[PDB]
Design a protein around this nucleic acid. Structure first.
Ligand code: OGA
Ligand code: MN
Length: 214
RNA sequence: UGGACUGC
């Protein structure tokens, strides 16, 4: 109710990438999945889950079960130079478009993470670690349409999700920017019922200078 | 039937 308007103030969203531009980027995402299957990336570049894969370029992070002590501020960057560099196509096809459209300043993005969701995949509600990433947070969706939900309570065995404070549809080719309240004081997630087809999203962030590393 | 928030 009153919190939903607080979330809306920190959301920017627009259809930035055309259908032709999405197809070219989605072919590059298929190249990343192929190299990961062939084991051509560094070990910490690929993070696999039952219905979701994360591909860390520039800077990666540990999360969830990878944390020995589960708590705020426990996420860590990987050692310097551990994960693979940002691919050239990410700079030219995605980051350059965002910089030229003034979504984020030039030289802001130093971390590009690709999330590849199989049908029915999800990601549990979370705040992007405040001790790791600066604000704002940019994400570009591909392959299919879906939604981003805020303030959801996850329960498991089996996975049940509560009603979101706000549901934001993320259409294919759209850019989502999170700032202020929507990025710091409320979690965001993806519910399994929002992934009907394969969906990939490229999240582009800047890590803090004092971000702790492994 | 696929798990970042108990930051309750
Ligand atoms: O698909 C999305 O936008 C959700 N992804 C995240 O919140 C994340 O990887 O940190
Ligand atoms: Mn996130």
């Amino acid at each position: 109710e009153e919190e939903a308007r607080k979330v809306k103030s920190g959301i920017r969203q627009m259809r930035l990438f055309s259908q032709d531009e999405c197809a070219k980027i989605e072919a590059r995402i298929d190249e990343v999945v192929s190299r990961a299957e062939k084991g051509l990336y560094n070990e910490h570049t690929v993070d696999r889950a039952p219905l979701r894969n994360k591909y860390f370029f520039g800077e990666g992070y540990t999360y969830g079960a990878q944390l020995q002590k589960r708590g705020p501020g426990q996420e860590r960057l990987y050692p310097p130079g551990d994960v693979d560099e940002i691919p050239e196509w990410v700079h030219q096809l995605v980051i350059q478009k965002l910089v030229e459209h003034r979504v984020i300043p030039e030289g802001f993005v130093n971390s590009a993470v690709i999330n590849d969701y199989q049908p029915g995949g999800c990601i549990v509600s979370h705040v992007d670690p405040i001790h790791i990433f600066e604000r704002p947070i940019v994400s570009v969706s591909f392959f299919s349409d879906s939604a981003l939900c805020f303030g959801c309570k996850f329960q498991f065995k089996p996975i049940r999700v509560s009603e979101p404070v706000l549901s934001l549809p993320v259409r294919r080719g759209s850019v989502t920017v999170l700032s202020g309240y929507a990025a710091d004081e409320i979690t965001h997630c993806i519910r399994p019922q929002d992934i009907k087809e394969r969906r990939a999203v490229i999240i582009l962030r800047k890590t803090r200078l004092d971000a702790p590393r492994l």
